Every structure is written in structure tokens, then in C-alpha cells.
Amino acid sequence: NLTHCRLFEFRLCLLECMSLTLDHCYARCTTVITQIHGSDTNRFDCTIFKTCYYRCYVLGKTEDHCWKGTATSVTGDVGDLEFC
Amino acid sequence: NLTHCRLFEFRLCLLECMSLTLDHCYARCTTVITQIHGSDTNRFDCTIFKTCYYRCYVLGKTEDHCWKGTATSVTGDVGDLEFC
């Protein structure tokens, strides 16, 4: 249901951006994904997935544990924010 | 602290998009704002504010009360999702 979000493309960009220790990778990679793949990648359901994923990471856990956990359990529904 | 998010102009776009009864207004206005102001409007703190506001709206609370409530109470910190 989240094919329009290009969530794997965003993840690749974020990992490469962070590996270069750049600033504001979440913001910059959102901009590139928008410019490459268009406005549908900014839907609220895409935003829910990205927020669950990046919150998990920002709060200490590992990027990989956060990605798999979000990808397996989060469909982009607004209620997902209460367990992800 | 959230001046870089251009949240006022985002709401302007969102309200006009809704008055025209268009689809995917969240996506359309996120895209237009970044196409005007660049990657800074896609920072995670902007995303925290917007998610607090739009979740409140998606769950049936009036749009104006969600925006005003979020603007007085949300600074964009990751913990803000726990009460907004």
C-alpha cells in the first residue's frame, strides 16, 4: 500500500548521506526523493512510516532494527504511531 | 525555533487546497513549500509539528483547534508525539 512512498530509495539516500557524516540528512534526502519521484512521496502515510522509522533511530536503537521493525509492522495508518 | 519550517505558509497552502476540495493536500503543500524554500522545511522537527497537527485533524478534531493547539504546545521535539 506504500509503493508510492519510495521508502527504500529514501533509506538508501539516508544511509549514504549519514555515511558521509552530512548535516540534516532526513531533510536533504526528503528533498531529493521529492525531486526525483514527485509529490506522492510526501503523503501523510509516507510521513507516518518515516516518522516511526526515524524516531526509533533517533531514540538510540539501530538503523537496521528500526527499518525492519517499521517495515514489518507499519502500514502508514495514523494509529500506527502508538506502537511503532 | 521552528521558523525554518515555514509553517504559516504551509497552512496557507493547505487551507486553500482544502477550500478547492483537492486530493492529497498534505502531499501537495509539502511539495510546494520545499520547492519554494528548500530542504530546511523537511527537517524532522518540522515533521514532528506537522504530524501532531494533521493527526489531530485526521482523527476528527476541527482543523483550526488542531493548528492552534499544536502551535502553542509543540516545539518539534521527538517526545512531543507522546501528548500532542
Numbering used by the authors:
A (entry chain B), B (entry chain A): 6 to 89
Tell me what the authors wrote about this structure, in their words.
The venoms of marine cone snails constitute a particularly rich source of peptide toxins, known as conotoxins. Here, we identify the sequence of an unusually large conotoxin, Mu8.1, which defines a new class of conotoxins evolutionarily related to the well-known con-ikot-ikots and 2 additional conotoxin classes not previously described. The crystal structure of recombinant Mu8.1 displays a saposin-like fold and shows structural similarity with con-ikot-ikot. Functional studies demonstrate that Mu8.1 curtails calcium influx in defined classes of murine somatosensory dorsal root ganglion (DRG) neurons. When tested on a variety of recombinantly expressed voltage-gated ion channels, Mu8.1 displayed the highest potency against the R-type (Cav2.3) calcium channel.
To elucidate key structural features of the SLC superfamily, we determined crystal structures of Mu8.1 from 2 different crystal conditions referred to as Mu8.1_38 and 59 at resolutions of 2.33 Å and 2.1 Å, respectively. The asymmetric unit of Mu8.1_59 accommodates 6 molecules that form 3 equivalent dimers. Each protomer of the Mu8.1 structure comprises 2 regions. The first region comprises an N-terminal 310-helix (310N), followed by 2 α-helices (α1 and α2), and a 310-linker helix (310L). The second region comprises 2 α-helices (α3 and α4), and the C-terminal 310-helix (310C). The 2 helical regions surround a hydrophobic core predominantly formed by aromatic residues (Phe15, Tyr31, Tyr58, Tyr59, Trp72). Moreover, α1, α3, and α4 are held together by a network of contacts between Arg16, Tyr58, Glu68, and Trp72, where ionic interactions are present between the side chains of Arg16 and Glu68, whereas Tyr58 and Trp72 partake in T-shaped pi–pi interactions. The dimer interface is characterized by both hydrophobicity as well as the presence of a water-filled cavity surrounded by the polar residues Thr36, Asn47, Thr52, and Thr56. The residues forming the largely dry (water-excluded) hydrophobic interface include Tyr31, Ala32, Phe49, Ile53, Tyr59, and Val83. Based on evidence from the analytic gel filtration and SAXS measurements, we concluded that Mu8.1 exists primarily as a dimer in solution.
